[PDB]
Amino acid sequence: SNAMEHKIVHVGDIPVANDKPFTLFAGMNVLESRDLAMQICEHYVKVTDKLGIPYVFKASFDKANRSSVHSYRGPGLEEGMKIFQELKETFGVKIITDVHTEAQAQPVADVVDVIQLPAFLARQTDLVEAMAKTGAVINVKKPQFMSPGQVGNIVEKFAECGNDKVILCERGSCHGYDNLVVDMLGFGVMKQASNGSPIIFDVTHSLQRREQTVELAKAGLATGIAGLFIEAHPNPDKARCDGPSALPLDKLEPFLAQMKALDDLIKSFAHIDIR
Amino acid sequence: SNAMEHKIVHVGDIPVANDKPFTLFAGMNVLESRDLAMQICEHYVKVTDKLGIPYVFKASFDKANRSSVHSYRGPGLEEGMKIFQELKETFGVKIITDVHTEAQAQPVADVVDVIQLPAFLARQTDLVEAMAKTGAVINVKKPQFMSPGQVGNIVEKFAECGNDKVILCERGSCHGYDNLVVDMLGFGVMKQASNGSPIIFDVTHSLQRREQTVELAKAGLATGIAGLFIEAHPNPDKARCDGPSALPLDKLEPFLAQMKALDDLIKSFAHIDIR
Amino acid sequence: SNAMEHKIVHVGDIPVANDKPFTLFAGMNVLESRDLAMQICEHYVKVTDKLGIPYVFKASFDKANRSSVHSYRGPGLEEGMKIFQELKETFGVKIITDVHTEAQAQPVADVVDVIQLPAFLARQTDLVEAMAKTGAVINVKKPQFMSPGQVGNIVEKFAECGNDKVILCERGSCHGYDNLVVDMLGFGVMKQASNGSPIIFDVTHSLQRREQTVELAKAGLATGIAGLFIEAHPNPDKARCDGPSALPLDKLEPFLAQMKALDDLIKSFAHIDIR
Amino acid sequence: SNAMEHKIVHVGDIPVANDKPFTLFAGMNVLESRDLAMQICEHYVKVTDKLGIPYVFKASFDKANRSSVHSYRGPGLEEGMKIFQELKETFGVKIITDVHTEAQAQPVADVVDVIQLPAFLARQTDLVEAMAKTGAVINVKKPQFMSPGQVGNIVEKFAECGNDKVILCERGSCHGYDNLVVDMLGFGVMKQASNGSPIIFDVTHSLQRREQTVELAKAGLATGIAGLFIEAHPNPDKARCDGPSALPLDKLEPFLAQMKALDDLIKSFAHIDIR
Structure with a gap:
């Protein structure tokens, strides 16, 4: 069959597309503290700037779906936005974070470059609408329970709300x-x-383990994809959420150098028409 | 092992429990119109009153998770509550409906007897909290993506918010x-x-077909359970949502007569201690 | 839809069919010793004779698919047949056992009443042929990896080889x-x-645990089926294979009394035509 | 964790190992005719000789597990061996084929270089024994129903029978x-x-479609593996078995050139120790 044309979604200067060099959407799971966010962001910026990899910093300001109510959830919106603000001014980074309710969409869109629709929430029509209305770039987490053929309906719902x-x-x-x-x-x-x-491809959450990050990232990249989504921490075991899948922050460079080499080859391969 | 003790949750006079006669939580998928809700409710009341089966009427006032934005969603909260109100005054029915946002929980709790947490939303902690705070009886839809051993965390989250x-x-x-x-x-x-x-056991949504409602209902009842959850319609094919699984309303009686006979036997069996 | 007509397969006097009283195909996993086979068979005969349940004694003469070569496999064909022979002469029982190679089919058919095609072998055409050719009643284990809609091909393959x-x-x-x-x-x-x-329905292998035998047996029986397949042992933990799923032999009676009561009700229910 | 040491299994001169250049085990599904086997083998030899890829020719002499008895199964053992013999003498190829019964193992081992244990048969202990006893290189198809952690038992069973x-x-x-x-x-x-x-990695059977051969092959190769297993045909649609997954034979070269480039990179990457 013919190679199809791939859509470009710009996150500022960054052209995100399946047939462009992969973009790294990565950071930490939750905004544990300002210092930790600064340390993690700086390392990612330094490494991606060195390797020549497009980069968008990720962290959650709230964990809305933990298993206990008293259990740590993040700094919340107000204080999370302050940290994103400092990251942007300090480092010049693009930012992605997730939103969990309709009323969070615009205020977070006012600060960040990409707003993320959580997997469990990805069919909530009023949330899609509120997120669509901000005009922000969207990242939609594909539900664990959804077949891949069904993602068209998600894209279409955003389009109907005016967001492409x-x-x-x-x-x-x-x-x-x-x-x-x-x-x-x-x-x-x-x-x-x-x-x-x-x-x-969110390699980190796919591993819900972290030892296997490398092997799984290479397999997904090998299919020709627009980016990787990764969470890391200086000591994953002490991460306040999802530590068991987080990449050790010190391994970011050797990992990304391999990803870049792999992606660069993959992106160079001609389409083979098999019928 | 020993037979454990089962908790009773009262929906008014109705003691809902795994070792009590099964309670029917049933109705229609969505509040398509007042007349349809009245016709469906009346038939269920008549049939359950005749057979001696405990009964709670179900319908959704909104479908929050369809695949298109312009696609029919129900009458919404204000007008849905009006219909529940008329059903209650006319027929003396207990009512269950689902809630989709924190702000819906109390106003719907003010009208209905049981508020339902949708499957996709069942881990949203702020929603659980808001629902817990109403003091209403809760029905939690077990996510398609959740193992059955994990339901304790859900019950516990409600308990921490003061709702048992x-x-x-x-x-x-x-x-x-x-x-x-x-x-x-x-x-x-x-x-x-x-x-x-x-x-x-929601037999109807488990079938996501309707021909098999009977066989699947009997299998679940045979395990000793507190109730069945069923949606029906006079002409399932024209139901405005999930028509393909809806029981034809005219078959409600022969179906329920069998369920009652089956449940009554099952509930009579002694526990067998197998180690 | 209309209730369809169900085929009767006779194991001597026993009419086996989906709409007849359920037939028990049960025994032990493997022919551990003659004394154990005699003790187990006697208990099953006594209990089924008392309850009025049709009965076919099950045991394997070989375990052909264990995970180690030196690991215990049974008495083998020659000596297994001797034990079946003694069970038949002593107790007047019908016998079912599994066959694993083409060359085993006729010699085992010469002794037993039902020959069983193992799940992993169920698509092996030459084995189906050899088994078909004996004219024996066949029991085919549905592979764990096969969809239920595909069982027609199995029945058809036997029919083409002259065995219905x-x-x-x-x-x-x-x-x-x-x-x-x-x-x-x-x-x-x-x-x-x-x-x-x-x-x-092989409840025992479905549990690959034994505590849940009762609940799962009732669920399957509730769908209207021709029989149950069960393995038991005086002390399941010391069973030489699949002990962890085996029913404790002493619990056979209370279990079967419940199965009979349940089946008898189920078999009494009219078909409900739902379209 | 440390990079472990990988075992080398020689198929003549070909060192097959996870950290060596990938070996192609490929051919056609079934030995449809001598001319077709000659045409297919020649193309694979020419292409692999050109690209510098290690090569073992695959075809089945029997399809033992089709869904109908009268349905085409291949030339059988005697005549299949004759074709393998001619392929070996003509082209100097190593050959792999599957064996389905204990009695086939030695006579096929006498002709071919690698004997293959079918997925459905992979736990049959007597077959493993008979295959082990030939001293031939073995290829074991991992059952669709087996977890990857369980493959040690298979390797161990062969080792106990003297075959490493x-x-x-x-x-x-x-x-x-x-x-x-x-x-x-x-x-x-x-x-x-x-x-x-x-x-x-058998990419072809994993697709049980053929359009996706390329993408799936690259993903598996990206994890660092010892080879690829592929079936092809000049016109897959007319292949006498499993046509819908067969690679079109004319596309073999562009496909393999990409595989080689990808494998060569992958095999060059240092191990990253992630704990």
Whole structure:
């Protein structure tokens, strides 16, 4: 079949697309403290600036879906925005974060470059609407429970609300109970179903372990995708959420150098028409 | 092992529990019109009153998670509450409906007897809190993506927010892409993990087909459960949502007569201690 | 839809069919010793004779698919047949056992009443042929990896080889890694795909745990099926294979009394035509 | 963690190992005719000789597990061996084929270089024994129903029978009904569980579609594996079995040139120690 045309979604200067050099959407799970966010952001900026990899800093200001109510959730919106603000002014970074309610969408859109629709919330029509209305670039987490052929409906819902700036993010599919598998065929399926919307791959959450980050990242990149989504921490074990999948921050460079070399080759391969 | 003690959650006079006669939580998918809600409610009341089956009328006032924005969603809260009000005054029915945002919880709790936490929203902590705070009986839809051993965390989150009136509802588990299976072992697992919270079974959504309602209902009832959750319509094919799984309303009586006979036997069986 | 007609497969005097009283195909996993086989058979005969339940004694003479070569496999064919022979002469029992190679089919058919096609072998055409050629009643284990709609091909393969005496046996379906789920909808599907061939349910292997035998047996029986397949042992923990799922032999009576009461009700229910 | 040492299994001069250049085990599904086998073999030899890729020709002499008895199965053993013989003398190729019964193992081992254990048969202990006893290199198809951590038991069973020449072959895992997914994490798991036995990837059967051969092959290769297993045909649609997944033979070169470039990079990457 013919190679299809891929859509470009700009995050400022960064052209995000399936057939462009991969963009790194990465950071930490939650904004644990200002100092930690500054340390992590600085390392990512330094490393990506060195390797020549497009970069958008990720962190959550709230964890809205933990298993206990008293359990640590982040700094919340007000204080999280302050930290994003300082990261932007200090480092000149683009920022992505997730939003959890309709009323959060515009105030967070006022600060960050990409707003993220959580997997469990990805079919909530009023949230999609509120997020669409900000005109912000969107990242939609593909639900663990959704087939890859169904991502067109998500893109279309945003388009109906006037927003054509959608990036889709792979984060694994249910494989029996309490395990996820990443279907590498799903990348192609989503590229088709979305008429070439950029697809990125959340390797970290797909591992819900961290030792396997490298191998799984290479497999997804090998399918020709618009980016990788990664969370890291100086000591993953002490991360306040999802520590068991977080990449050790000190390994970011050797990991990314390999990703870049791999992506650069992959992006150079001609399409083979197989019928 | 020993038979454990099962918790009773009262919906007014109705004692809902795994070892009591099953309670029917049933109605229609969405409040399509006042006349349709009146016709459907009346038939269910007449049939359940005749058979001697405890009954709580179900309908949604909004469909918050459809695949298109312009697509029909229901009458919304204001007008839906008016219809519930008329159903209550006319028929003396208990009512269950789902809530989709924190701000909906109290105003709907002011009208209905049981508020329902949708499957996709079941881990949203702020929603659980808002729902817990109303003091209303809760029905939690078990996510397709959640293992049955994990339902304890849901019950516990409500308890921490001061609400011990939780009923759990089985609605199938992911089985590959775009199919669901109901694990009949999950009933026992949830009864254990929840310290005997009432478990009901949404047969209709488990079938996401309707021909198989009977066979699947009997299998779930055979495991000893607190109730069944069913949606019906005079002509399922013209139902404005999820028509393909809805029971034809005219078949309600022969279906329920069988359920009652089956439940009555099941509830009579002694526990067998197998180690 | 209309209730379809169900095929009867006779194991001597026993009419095995989906709409007849359920037949018990049960015994022990492997022929551990003559004394154990005699003790187990006697208890099953006594209990089933008392309750009025049709009965076929099960045991394997070889375990052909263990994980180690030096690991205990049974008495083998010659000596296993001797034990079946003594069971038949002593107790007047019908016997079912599994066959693993083409050359085993006729010599075992010469002794037993039902020959069983193992799940992993169920698509091996030359084995189906050799088994078909004996003219024996067949029990086919449905592979964990096979959809229920595909059982027609199995029945048809036997029919082409001249054998119309096939019983199909449910034993769970893959649910992610290292777990099985039993799809209760699959019973109806197989009844349709097989034009009403008798379907029995191996509760014991579906549990690959034993505590849950009761609950799962009741769920499967509730769908209207031709029999149950059960393995038991005086002390399951010391069973030489699959001990962790074996029913404790002393619990056979209370278990079967419940099964009979349940089946008798189920078999009394009229078909409900839902379209 | 440390990079482990990988075992080399020689197929003549060809060192097959996870950290060596990938070896191509490829050909056609079934030996449809001598001329077709000659045409297909010649093209593969020419292309692999040109690209510098190690090569072992694959074809089945029998399809033992089709869905109908009268349905085409291949030339059978006698005549299949004759064709392998001519391929070897003409082209100097190494040959792999599958064996289906104990009695086939030695006579096929007498002709071919690698004997293959089919997925459905992979736990049959007597077959493993008979295959082990030939001293031939073995390729074991990993069952769709087996977790990757369980491959150690297979390698160990061969070792107990005196055969340490085992190669493991990924061919997908059950993903609900009638679909397979390839878990890219399973490669690492098998490398560990098998103490570094060579793992190859059957891309063709994993697709049980053919359009996606390229994308899936690249994903598996990206994890660092010992080879690829591929079936092709001049006109896949007219292939006498599994046509819908077969690579079009004319596309072999552009496909393999990409595989080689990708593998060569992957094999050059240092291990990253992530804890």
